[PDB]
Write a protein that binds this ligand. Structure first.
Ligand SMILES: *C(=N)c1nc(OC)cc(OC)n1
Ligand SMILES: *C(=N)c1nc(OC)cc(OC)n1
Lengths: 304, 304
């Protein structure tokens, strides 16, 4: 029993973190096979960042200008290329600790672990979600760029995020491992405002199922609702609309607890309308939305 | 910017996790050098657990009854001994991945990372604190015993906790790596009720400093208080008394923000008396107490 905001074990990803320096800029790189992936803004000075022409800036860079260090040892760069907003630095040595891996582009609402790094060295691991406005609420200081987000399926690491940027509102933006930003963000120090950060309804419902499984049941009520009635309330509260696909995804948690998905929607509807009244659910005074239904099943079953 | 409940990178500890089986019971062991540490209740059947005499039960066990598996390979047990509530299984092979390590016994209020494991395999990593009533609020299922809590200082892992038990209220109890339980708990399936779970005042104040550093400042007020006046309010709200040692510990965060510790105490006093009024601090609707002042400095500076 007990339910925590849990990150995947980070060891497989720690073995891939390297330091990348270009000129006076140092950030993190991800070393998989004989390629080091890093944000292309490693080539920018703080001034360049205001309006960078990456193709033009990159012309002034050669393989020997990209200093890649893995632990105490230097890696030899034998090629470099730009793919969207990431640089791929081909090195002469395959990473001996390369885990089984995939590059995946996640959808909003999906969660992942972040291994925050500085100078190619891991500092911490935390769990977060791709917000519906394509930002993430991370913990990143200067030098954390190139830190990655990932999920693990037994022994295969699916890398989904690489840190690039902080918006003036303190939220974060980044790319998948193909260098494509999530959302409309660009790697330029310009006015970039995020859209509405709606709540991930399907994740709140999954977390309410985790609460019932772990003994917090005070919020269960005698009501039911329909998808359309629930969605009228969800729109009022800036919650994402619940679809029949979300209901289907919650099927196993509904089966485990015996609480029909629409009944849990009615409990959530009352929590939105009445508030918590100073009460907590799984140690939280707000409705948590950074656990997917898969995360709840995984944590409640103990998948390794 | 941004502030997350962050765990230490788990790789160094993942390299130490093994599976220990005695008869029909399987749990986790911690393999450091040529010793495997595990809860002594590995020798108990579910019936034995009601009133076990460990010394007597242990007489019926030989080295060959302790099956220790590290990954896919079996370790040879060449000795076994009981130290308090842990067993130390001497194996014939030193763990090649043994990190630099220490065994530390933490005080209430101190935080640590837990690498939850099942069958010697890591499932997740999360951050928690030793509560003032000597319980921890973890996420542990059957088979998670022997999972450990730790802190890291650059390359040295300080192991502080080993999971043994869940109380009927869903909170957890365990030992340090010398086998001594935190608090008054025993490794017996008997009526064990936890005392008052007070809030760790010094940690709430540290987290309010992290909120100011990361831009959440709405709760700052025009008031100040004294330790004695603050402590009258802290007692009313089941908060731990703040001492001059806690004030001294918050000195660097006070210096960084320019907010005197007693002024932050006055902000906390008003938050306790007035509530949050539907507002949040660092994404939380309650006052968070599982970040020590050291954690706040570490996360706000990016220590690797
Ligand atoms: C990422 N490491 C990073 N670091 C900065 O300064 C040290 C600035 C920045 O701007 C995008 N990114
Ligand atoms: C710890 N792994 C554990 N597992 C149990 O059943 C599988 C019971 C238990 O009781 C102390 N501990």
């Amino acid at each position: 029993s007990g339910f925590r905001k849990m990150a995947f074990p980070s060891g497989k990803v720690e073995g891939c973190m390297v330091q990348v320096t270009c000129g006076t800029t140092t950030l993190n790189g991800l070393w998989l096979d004989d390629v080091v992936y890093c944000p292309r803004h490693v080539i920018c000075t703080s001034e360049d960042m205001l309006n960078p022409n990456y193709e033009d800036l990159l012309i002034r860079k050669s393989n020997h200008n990209f200093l890649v260090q893995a632990g105490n040892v230097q890696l030899r760069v034998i090629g470099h290329s730009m793919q969207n907003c990431v640089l791929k630095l081909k090195v002469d040595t395959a990473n001996p600790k390369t885990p089984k891996y995939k590059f995946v582009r996640i959808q909003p609402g999906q969660t992942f672990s972040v291994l925050a790094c500085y100078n190619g060295s891991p500092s911490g691991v935390y769990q977060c979600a791709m917000r519906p406005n394509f930002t993430i609420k991370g913990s990143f200081l200067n030098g954390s760029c190139g830190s990655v987000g990932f999920n693990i399926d037994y022994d295969c690491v699916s890398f989904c995020y690489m840190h690039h940027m902080e918006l003036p509102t303190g939220v974060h933006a980044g790319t998948d491992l193909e260098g494509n930003f999530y959302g409309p963000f660009v790697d330029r120090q310009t006015a970039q405002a995020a859209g509405t950060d709606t709540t991930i309804t399907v994740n709140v419902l999954a977390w309410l199922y985790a609460a019932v499984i772990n003994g917090d049941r005070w919020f269960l009520n005698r009501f039911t609702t329909t998808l359309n009635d629930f969605n009228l309330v969800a729109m009022k509260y800036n919650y994402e609309p619940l679809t029949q696909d979300h209901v289907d995804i919650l099927g196993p948690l509904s089966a485990q607890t015996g609480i029909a998905v629409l009944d849990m929607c009615a409990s959530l509807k009352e929590l939105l309308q009445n508030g918590m009244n100073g009460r907590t659910i799984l140690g939280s005074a707000l409705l948590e939305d950074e656990f997917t239904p898969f995360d709840v099943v995984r944590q409640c079953s103990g998948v390794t």
